[PDB]
Design a protein around this nucleic acid. Structure first.
Ligand SMILES: [Mg+2]
Length: 755
RNA sequence: UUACCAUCAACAUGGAAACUUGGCUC
RNA sequence: GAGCCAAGUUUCCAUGUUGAUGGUA
């Protein structure tokens, strides 16, 4: 079905885009596999060899290193005898004619992209990582030996509107200090302690090589080897590093006394990739620059481009493309005529939602923030909390009394009935003293409602162990404060406000909600938390709405061992969720809405045709249970940018903007929603892909329901990017994966204990 | 770990095309 | 000859995560 979703609800917004329309007038593409037999690999020297033959291959070539594209229909299988122009050896190349590609094809998308990477190469922009950056517009920090290149993450894609060039104005941190120059500086710093200092600085530090443009993690540094030595290339051939770089890449290496960097490929090839530090350069903010206020503020104020500056950089790119004769010729020879200005459309702005409290219901302002409108009125349900204990190591004791004073001053308009705690001073600041004191306080007394601790500095092990005690071993709701958030009195008041709201959340109270027209709605939020350190011990959190007014969230956690499946884990989580829903609501829901987090574009069909059929196979375990299911793939980090056409320039878009045309994928029912208010930089929306819709949910109530679920998040009094169940599931899975490493207590799963 | 939002640095996973290798295989 | 599966390389991409900076509450 064709995607016609742009309805009348919401006001039209003239949105500029980071999209430039590309009109294609190609008539035939032919794809060949060049088969250089003595194995040249440079991606530019091979381009030079393919440009050496402009007669048989013509002057129009979309070459990329191993795949050639022609419009000329060259004969099947030919051979050529090119010259390497380096150290002398004739180069025997082949031609394959693998495929015939039609004009309007999605397999021409890599060919279009290769043409445009060549076009950016014709603007003298360097290729760093996977993007193109301009060193002419670079800004330099000489005090840190670093530069920022303003360039573009650009890619041609086929959306509903057709062929588009997505160009995001990215910035590349290019460190002028080489790795070899870093070893030179450290060797100047100390002599005997040079190698171990380079070991602790470099192992874990990740470098780039710009001659092939690849990033490698330094797993070790070998000081016993030097480029001069010899290694074996994949044709089983023994050659030195210098000869390999002067032949396969055409680079003469200045210094040959440099050591070697070993990158061990994880999740296994067993090949020690061996790296030269002359062509290896670090990427990232240096250690001395991290604590610099001026340098980081200049870097941040440059990279936090407003939509006016974003569109200005895109217009500069289009002006550079149009003014350069070679780039315009290269685009025109393929029939790819670029647009002079970026694409712009008319999106919709969704209406504001009445946030409801116990007695007051207020329409949200344009800021979409209710920070001060919720600490002046009462929450919907406020559980009174009297018996609790505050744990402090006598150094934040004044800060503890200040926090208690602010809490009892603010519990009035909040609605909490707050009693003074047990002021548990700790004889030591150790984790063992903390845990034994909490356990001894709860061992004798069973009427204690809460345990609130104060942590000296940033201690992740102490917070993790406190949460290990509090929602696994002894199910007591917990709260952890730092001394940096209650020290100064300037922000102490709002900190105490949100802390008391957190106390009300972790006890089963309800903070705020909106009116929802959909009845018996069964909201599911999931976030498959992947572990890159525990041997792929994936954690799937599961947050399920329970009451009809969409305010109680029953939580579940399932762990995935190696060689397991998400199927039975989601089976157990869903049957537990419907068991809780039946035991509370005394009914069964007619509509289950699932918000799956983190699915790539390739795994979308895998999610749609494999996992969700088993999700409806869970449904037969109950008595004639067949409701209507709606599954969402949520993609938060995207590269599409929305602008707002003010009558002078481009500004940040108003929060709550939907785009359901011209950007969406062809094979799915998609839209982009910018729900949150953003004041820094450009407002990235969040991609919302309908994997399945059995409820016949039109995109009017679909977008409105996702926007409404963006409001329900109770750890922030305003709109967040993802919906509230996605963020609840993400925090639950993060706490059960990196902090708990265990399933929680079932009773504490009745409340938002992870907030 | 009082939160949310931006952008940067990196890692990990997955898809499509082409090619190569090794098994089957009609 | 055609087809299936596994692994790898090169192109194009997509998604998540961890840090680090800022902002404001
Ligand atoms: Mg999530």
């Amino acid at each position: 079905e064709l995607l016609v979703k742009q309805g009348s609800k919401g006001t039209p917004q003239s949105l500029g885009l980071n999209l430039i329309k590309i009109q294609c007038h190609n008539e035939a593409v032919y794809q060949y596999h060049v088969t250089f037999s003595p194995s040249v690999e440079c991606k530019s020297m091979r381009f030079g060899m393919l440009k050496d033959h402009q007669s048989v291959t013509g002057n129009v070539t979309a070459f990329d290193g191993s795949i050639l594209y022609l419009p000329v229909k060259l004969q099947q299988v030919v051979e050529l005898k090119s010259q390497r122009k380096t150290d002398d050896a004739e180069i025997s190349i082949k031609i394959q004619l693998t495929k015939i590609l039609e004009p309007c094809s999605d397999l021409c998308i890599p060919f279009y992209n290769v043409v445009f990477r060549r076009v950016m190469k014709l603007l003298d922009m360097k290729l760093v990582g996977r993007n193109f950056y301009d060193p002419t517009s670079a800004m330099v920090l000489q005090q840190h030996r670093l530069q920022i290149w303003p360039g573009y993450a650009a890619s041609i894609r086929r959306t509903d509107g057709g062929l588009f060039l997505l160009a995001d104005v990215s910035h590349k941190v290019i460190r002028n200090d080489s790795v070899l120059d870093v070893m030179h500086a450290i060797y100047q710093q100390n002599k005997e302690h040079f190698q171990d200092e380079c070991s602790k600085l470099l192992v874990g530090s990740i470098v780039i090589t710009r001659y092939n443009n690849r990033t490698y993690r330094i797993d070790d540094v070998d000081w016993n080897k030097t480029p001069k030595d010899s290694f074996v290339m994949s044709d089983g051939k023994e050659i030195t590093f210098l000869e390999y770089y002067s032949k396969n890449y055409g680079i003469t290496v200045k210094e040959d006394d440099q050591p070697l960097l070993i990158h061990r490929p994880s999740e296994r090839l067993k090949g020690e990739i061996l790296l030269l530090p002359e062509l290896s350069f670090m990427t990232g903010i240096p250690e001395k620059m991290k604590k610099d206020f001026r340098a980081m503020k200049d870097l941040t104020q440059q990279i936090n481009l407003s939509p006016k500056q974003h569109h200005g950089a895109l217009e500069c790119l289009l002006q550079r493309i149009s003014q350069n004769e070679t780039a315009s010729n290269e685009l025109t020879r393929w029939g790819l005529s670029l647009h002079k200005d970026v694409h712009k459309i008319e999106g919709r702005l969704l209406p504001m939602e009445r946030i409801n409290l116990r007695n007051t219901s207020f329409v949200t302002s344009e800021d979409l923030n209710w920070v001060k409108e919720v600490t002046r009125d009462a929450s919907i349900l406020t559980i009174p909390m009297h018996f609790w204990a505050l744990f402090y190591p006598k150094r934040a004791m004044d800060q503890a009394r200040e926090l208690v004073n602010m809490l009892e001053k603010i519990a009035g308009p909040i609605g909490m009935r707050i009693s003074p705690p047990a002021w548990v001073e700790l004889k030591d600041d150790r984790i063992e003293t903390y845990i034994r004191t909490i356990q001894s306080l709860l061992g004798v007394e069973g009427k204690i409602q809460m345990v609130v601790c104060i942590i000296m500095g940033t201690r992740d092990d102490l917070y993790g162990a406190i949460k290990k005690l509090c929602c696994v071993q002894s199910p007591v709701p917990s709260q952890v404060i730092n001394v940096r958030t209650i020290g100064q009195p300037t922000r102490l008041r709002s900190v105490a406000q949100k802390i008391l709201l957190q106390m009300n959340c972790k006890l089963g109270g309800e903070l705020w909600g909106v009116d929802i027209p959909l009845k018996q709605l069964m909201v599911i939020g999931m976030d498959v938390y992947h572990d890159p350190s525990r041997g792929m011990r994936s954690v799937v959190g599961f947050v399920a709405s329970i009451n009809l007014t969409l305010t109680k969230w029953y939580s579940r956690v399932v762990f995935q061992m190696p060689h397991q499946e998400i199927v039975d884990s989601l089976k157990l989580c869903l049957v537990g969720s419907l068991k809780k829903y039946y035991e509370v609501n005394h009914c069964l829901p007619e509509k289950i809405v699932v918000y799956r987090d983190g699915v790539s574009d390739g795994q979308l069909k895998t999610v749609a045709n494999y996992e969700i059929p088993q999700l409806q196979k869970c449904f037969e375990a109950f008595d004639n249970y067949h409701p209507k299911m709606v599954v969402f793939v949520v993609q938060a980090k995207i590269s599409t940018n929305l602008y707002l056409a003010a009558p002078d320039h481009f500004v940040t878009p108003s929060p709550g903007t939907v785009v359901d045309h011209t950007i969406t994928s062809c094979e799915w029912v998609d839209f982009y929603l910018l729900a949150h208010h953003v004041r820094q930089g450009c407002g990235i929306p969040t991609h919302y892909i309908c994997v399945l819709n059995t409820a016949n949910l039109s995109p009017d109530h679909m977008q409105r329901l996702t926007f409404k679920l963006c409001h329900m998040y109770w750890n922030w009094p305003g709109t967040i990017r993802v919906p509230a169940p996605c963020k609840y599931a993400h925090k639950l899975a993060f706490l059960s994966g990196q902090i708990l490493h265990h399933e929680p207590a079932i009773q504490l799963c009745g409340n938002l204990f992870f907030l």
